[PDB]
DNA sequence: TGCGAAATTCCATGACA
DNA sequence: ATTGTCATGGAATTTCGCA
DNA sequence: TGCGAAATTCCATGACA
DNA sequence: ATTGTCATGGAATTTCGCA
């Protein structure tokens, strides 16, 4: 069997509902299987139509060769196997209740909700203008299993915007305090 | 004066009055006998004011000039005191075309990785498609990688929207764009300043600085052209697809897509190229390092036979940007403070400021 | 089809299939071991759609589209199949630009005698002096001698009132114009019929055609412009100033003013040229005869090392005039119908008549 | 003394009142000593700011050494001289009741009336349209004393306009009938 | 070790308005 | 303080297939 | 029958928008 | 059925003045 390789699979999946920001209150996630490469996508609902103009939007940068996700209503709807159908991606379902990744994914997927909420405290609606930033964090974040970040596995250089400071991603004093205030 | 026309009328010899040829007197003038006929000689005082009138007659050149005087006139040196007011007519220095050509064009090295340089500017007005005028077209350097956006106007506002989905990719070193309203702000200055972006302007009214997108824009005009032969021009929907289209789009020089220089390995398009499908992404990263750094790069062309090439200290002319109907196409003299490189220079400008300009924009001041 | 194909996978020889190599099967598909690696061969009857997929991603001409190809798929001469389609698509033939210099520019002879052709055009609008906004240019093609008439518009009725001023004067044989419509309407075809004034027309859009007035405008130009140095633009008065400038004007390389090659003697101007003083007039119009035919003359330049000329029957593309944003540059492919001189043709155009066009409104259909 | 040239001397003057044809009155009449090449212009009167107008027109084709005129008021006027020397033409002026040209010029200036009043009736009204075809007449007239005509002498070629039926220049029986009916 | 044909490379042209 | 670029299709050149 | 300097001719550049 | 042109100022070349 050939060596893995990015644009080999992408993981989508939604996030959500969250305090509205700018209008949107969700955030599609996209993470490329080999890489760990994480784009990010706000909408306004789990549609499928929502999906679809979001996709699109990165399919006309790189296209998957699969697309897998768990059977989420948008995701299984015939309209987005038709779309998927048309871009000659194939489509690829968890069984309900039983999601499965890869460990790779799985963790990407932690810090991502992690880095969510320690930024939506303090500021839960102004995070629609930071998801430029959160990106740029999740794909300079070094690796552990692979020598390199997911930038570098991309593109196969170092980054101009380095995160030298690997962050703590964990709740001080003050915002376990008004977040257990925030949402009670 | 009649200093040396006195000492001539005898018959002695002044230097630069050939001693062959007779010098008389006759209705109260000196004359002289020479192949072409009988001329006047003036007097050195007379001479400048017969040069000018001769000249004003039609604003003409050293040899046109030169003509009208020979008609009536022999003295020695003419053509040194036509050449003396050619250089002091404002009129004329500032009207007239230059008939010198720029030094070859520099082909600056590309950018040695992704990232480092962005190339930026706005095609349009085009027809209104949903509303929107124009496209903010963004250009990697290195890669050619090119990334889209509609939008209303060329604005600094929509120029940060599209930007800041953009740079959630990555952050590039440079941004290199024209001196455009939207890239000049302040806004927009602060905009880079708070990314650690620097951001580079090429020298006024010169496109060919921004070649790398400029370039750019044509092919993505063609195409559009093309996908909306014998249709209603409506663009906006196809923005994604002629990008898409373009970034793995061979160039037939380099033998790669600007896909596959920037992530060295096609995505799920058509005809993909899989020659890699053995390697490791390692041995591919490997390989794509190679790839980028042994591409063709072209080298300046041989100068034309006359051009000019600036040196510090010179009287030089910036062309006037948008000159009015019968209004002159050139600046008053300015001199080279300094020489950043063969095709451009700092210059003592027409009001009093520094000033950074191309060649291209310049003629050398002539007669000195 | 499979035809050729299942003969091949046993181990015959079909001719452009080069011997030496070996042709499997594999995943119900032909395959072969290619230096650069396995790629499928497609049977014959799927070959077009195959090209005219990788063309259309993004419209791509020769190199591009075959490199595409090439990353999937080897058979017997590709590119030729690749030009096929090139020829074929209406989309790029329209357009692309074209990569094929004109022939070198002729050069006619001048007219042998004053009066003989006249060459008219308008400049303008200019900013408004006392009502007026264009020029009436008249040169007459032997002498270069110039008339100028102020109007309010580059009319009919204007270039008729001033003509019938300067023909007062002499009638000339042919007067040649571009397509203006000011030149092309019937009542200024009566108006010349009446006179027995052959009109002579540019092919459309060739201004160079019109080389003779059009040169003279740029001097008209730009004596204005140097009279008006830090004045209000008011050109009017200057019309008759900027006339008698230029008529008595020498010309460099012919050693005569306009005014001499027309009458051959100065007139009471400045710097007036004598040289003929003892001559009866007749004696001078003898020296003027001569002159006249003894002009400098000078002849077409070497061609590009990538030029074409026309041929009859040949399929070559009219430039669209005015095209609109996002439409192609070019009209349909059409025939050379004559071929005129190397530098005009007539074809059979985009609707069905026949044009008279220059070369350099034309190129030549690609891929045949 | 060297030999006549054109633009050696113009002789100018009036011929007019006239009936009014598009508002115009008067006739300057401008006649090259030399070569005898017509030029005529219409005028609204005989002063000295519509000779300045019209010489305008003329001395931007050519400048002549000398003007010759009567001492019409038009041009003993100091305006007038002040309009010459600028422009370095000397005035010349035949003593008053007695005026003197040359021959030809007499001649000419005798041609000039009689074609005028010719075309006159019927149209008297009708001249202005018809100046050019006089002056092209009159320049491609033959001159008896001179193997040539006045276009010829002043452009040393043919014309396209050679006149070849040498006119009547004379009032036949049913144009002196209604001269005689109009000026009665 | 040399031929004829195909494949590849070269590069002037022109447009980014 | 900055700087031209590159798809295109004929033609020139090199390589391939075979002997 | 030759030199140094002036005069003339050559010609690429660019604009007629 | 029509078609480039020519002022310009440095540089290249020729001619002039003298011996
Ligand atoms: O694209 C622009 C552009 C212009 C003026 C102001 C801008 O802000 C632009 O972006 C002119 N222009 C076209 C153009 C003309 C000629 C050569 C090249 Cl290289 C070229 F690109
Ligand atoms: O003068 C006109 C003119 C035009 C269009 C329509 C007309 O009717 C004109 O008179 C363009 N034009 C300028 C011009 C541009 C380029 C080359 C040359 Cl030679 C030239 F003259
Ligand atoms: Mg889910
Ligand atoms: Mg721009
Ligand atoms: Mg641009
Ligand atoms: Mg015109
Ligand atoms: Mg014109
Ligand atoms: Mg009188
Ligand atoms: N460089
Ligand atoms: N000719
Ligand atoms: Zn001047
Ligand atoms: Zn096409």
């Not at chain 2, 006929?37 to 007659?57: C, F, M, T, Y």
């Not at chain 2, 060329?154 to 070193?173: E, G, R």
């Amino acid at each position: 069997d050939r060596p893995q390789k990015p644009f080999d699979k992408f993981f989508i999946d939604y996030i959500g509902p969250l305090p509205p920001s700018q209008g949107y209150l969700y955030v599609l996630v996209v993470v490329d299987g080999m890489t760990g490469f994480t784009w990010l996508y706000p909408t306004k609902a789990p549609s499928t139509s929502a999906t679809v103009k979001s996709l699109n939007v990165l399919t006309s940068i790189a296209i998957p060769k699969v697309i897998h996700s768990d059977q989420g209503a948008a995701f299984t709807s015939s309209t987005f196997a038709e779309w998927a159908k048309e871009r000659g991606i194939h489509l690829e379902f968890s069984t309900p209740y039983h999601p499965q990744s890869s460990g790779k994914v799985e963790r990407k997927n932690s810090d991502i909700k992690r880095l969510l909420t320690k930024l939506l405290v303090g500021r839960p609606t102004k995070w629609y203008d930071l998801l430029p930033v959160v990106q740029l964090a999740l794909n300079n974040t070094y690796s552990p299993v692979l020598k390199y970040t997911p930038h570098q596995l991309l593109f196969g250089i170092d980054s101009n915007t380095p995160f030298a400071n690997q962050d703590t991603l964990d709740l001080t004093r003050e915002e376990e305090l008004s977040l257990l205030q925030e949402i009670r | 004066l009649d200093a040396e026309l006195d000492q001539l009328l005898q018959g002695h010899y002044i230097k630069g009055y050939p001693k062959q040829y007779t010098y008389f007197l006759e209705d109260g003038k000196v004359k002289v006998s020479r192949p072409e006929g009988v001329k006047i000689i003036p007097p050195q005082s007379d001479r400048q004011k017969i040069v000018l009138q001769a000249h004003n007659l039609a604003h003409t050149g050293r040899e046109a000039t030169l003509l009208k005087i020979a008609n009536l006139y022999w003295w020695p040196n003419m053509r040194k005191d036509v050449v003396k007011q050619l250089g002091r007519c404002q009129q004329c220095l500032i009207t007239n075309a230059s008939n010198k050509a720029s030094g070859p064009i520099l082909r600056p090295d590309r950018p040695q990785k992704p990232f480092d340089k962005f190339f930026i500017d706005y095609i349009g007005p085009l027809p209104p498609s949903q509303g929107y005028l124009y496209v903010l077209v963004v250009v990697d350097g290195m890669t050619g990688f090119t990334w889209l956006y509609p939008t209303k106007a060329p604005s600094t506002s929509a120029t940060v929207k599209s930007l800041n989905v953009l740079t959630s990719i990555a952050i590039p070193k440079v941004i290199h764009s024209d001196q455009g309203a939207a890239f000049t702000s302040s806004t927009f200055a602060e905009w880079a300043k708070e990314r650690g972006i620097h951001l580079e302007f090429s020298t006024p009214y010169h496109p060919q600085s921004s070649g790398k997108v400029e370039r750019k824009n044509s092919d993505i005009k063609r195409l559009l052209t093309k996908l909306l032969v014998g249709r209603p021009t409506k663009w906006y929907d196809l923005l994604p697809v002629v990008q898409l289209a373009l970034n793995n789009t061979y160039s037939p020089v380099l033998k790669y897509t600007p896909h596959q220089l920037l992530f060295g390995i096609d995505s799920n398009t058509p005809f993909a190229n899989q020659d890699t499908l053995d390697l490791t992404r390692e041995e591919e990263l490997s390989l794509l390092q190679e790839i980028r750094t042994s591409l063709y790069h072209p080298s300046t062309p041989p100068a034309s036979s006359r051009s000019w090439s600036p040196v510090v200290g010179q009287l030089v002319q910036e062309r006037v940007a948008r000159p009015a109907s019968l209004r002159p196409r050139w600046h008053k003299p300015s001199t080279v403070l300094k020489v950043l490189n063969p095709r451009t220079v700092v210059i003592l400008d027409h009001l009093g400021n520094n000033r950074t300009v191309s060649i291209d924009n310049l003629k050398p001041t002539s007669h000195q």
